[PDB]
């Protein structure tokens, strides 16, 4: 329903412009700051911004893909690269948010052991392992993503081919396994660990009941926005798989199919909303704007 | 008729291999030289340094598109990346050429106002700022390369399945007058990419050389490194840019000229056979600059030690 014309391409283009500008500005803010002033959360913020930027560079290609009634003229390599960068964005962003939340748990709840942990492991090592893990986890996308003229309508569609590793019979198993693993690694387990960190933070903060509140408020706003922007996508995707497995009504399946593009759109919009969230809450980002 | 048989002997994978090698070396070296120039203090950052950074950025923007050209050459000249990337890659080649020659001209003129007349250097710095100069040259390069972006198209010429990233002059001229547009674009590109910039560079260098010979009234090999360093590195950069791009411009101009004067067929075949290698050297220049920086001007070498 609601073919919507060019709403999705227009929103993709808008997110491209605003995400590029805002993420560049936030990178300028974080790198222009002194290394002495450079806080632990700054490296995670920078990595989050880099992930968003690497996604929004490919966003114009997705806008063109949508505008052309799903025809991909950029070839196989850029199909693989764009899908891979999408999943790298998702994984690295949720991992950076997890790192920020764990840092807040270390500081607010029990800073003494936080000092020892900071002595053992530096932030740069954490960022390195985070990015290599994200790249490794998104590798299946790059290996399996391909370019094909499905339905013999002279339209090229950038789709994941599971015939490279699985036959026709086990293609459903491979697709469901990859989807469930992607959900568990990008939403479920990171949200579980972040919720545990936030729960102990909430208990210790009941005991405490502004300096900690600055960082906690901005990070919780970031995490809640990430939740509201990615929960629709994971929910619709997992629900579609469970509907295929358990034979849910076809009306609900049609509803999920028609709402999937919009959920993907909001998941993409998160990248552009991150800088305005920094501007509204973080006083340093406002300082950079004035300075 | 008699000529136009083939392109000498098959290069195999030599052109794609050199393209990939230049991609790797140019990316690494240009990134490292950008790190060197940017890590240096802004107060310490010399006037030549910002032109150096612009040169490195142009080289980087070209070498990022270089893998696509390597893939294009590997698949017997078949372009699978689309018309947008054809336009972007060709436009970035021309932006690289123009910006590099303009930065070299700016470096040469900076050395001119440094050695020939130290007095007017401050006045000319006051009149035009360095950052303003780089912004002007970059917008000039973008505008001059815009015809490349507009006129590029991907098409399945010769009725084969191959897709060639080529220049379509039909959108701006008729078939009969396509030659006029092609010759005009080529001659203008040569004039504002090699001829005029090298003319002003040679004039500045001639007066620079006369001013230095004023001190070198007698034959003295080598020079006082303290003042020599920048001039030496800029001269080697200019000489290597000449040696890497002059073959390309020379073959291009000779082919366009023989389109009228009708050179002998064998010579036209020779030019056609040699064109890919001239393009290859012109592309090598981009990665070549960092190793030159690692040999002269101990800035770059000490940066590695630090
Ligand atoms: C449309 C399709 C067929 C085009 C295929 C293009 C292929 C051959 C090209 C495009 C860009 C290339 C990559 C560009 C950059 C890198 C990173 C470098 O550290 C190793 C090589 C590697 C990984 C290249 C491998 C080959 C590559 C993937
Ligand atoms: C193969 C063909 C059909 C694809 C064409 C894609 C077109 C519509 C897309 C691809 C990338 C896009 C560009 C990406 C970035 C910028 C910079 C921005 O400041 C102005 C718009 C501009 C210049 C876009 C214009 C539209 C654009 C060129």
Numbering used by the authors:
A (entry chain A): 24 to 232, 241 to 322
B (entry chain B): 17 to 322
According to the publication:
APJR has been extensively studied as a drug target for heart failure and cardiovascular diseases, with two endogenous peptide ligands: apelin and elabela (ELA)9–12. The formation of the APJR homodimer occurs through a small, hydrophobic interface at the junction of transmembrane helix III (TM3) and extracellular loop 1 (ECL1), facilitated by the “FGTFF motif” (human APJR residues 97-101).
Additionally, by processing further datasets of the apelin-13-APJR-Gi complex, we isolated a distinct particle class, enabling the elucidation of the structure of the APJR dimer in its apo state without Gi-protein coupling. This apo-APJR structure, with a global nominal resolution of 3.0 Å, displayed an inactive conformation similar to the antagonist-bound APJR structure, with RMSD of 0.604 Å. Comprehensive structural analysis revealed that in the absence of G protein interaction, whether bound to an antagonist, agonist, or in the apo state, the APJR forms compact and nearly exclusive dimers. Moreover, the dimer interface remains largely unchanged. Molecular dynamics (MD) simulations supported this hypothesis, showing that the dimer state in apo or antagonist-bound structures is more stable than in agonist-bound and Gi-protein coupled structures, as indicated by the RMSD of the overall backbone of APJR dimers.
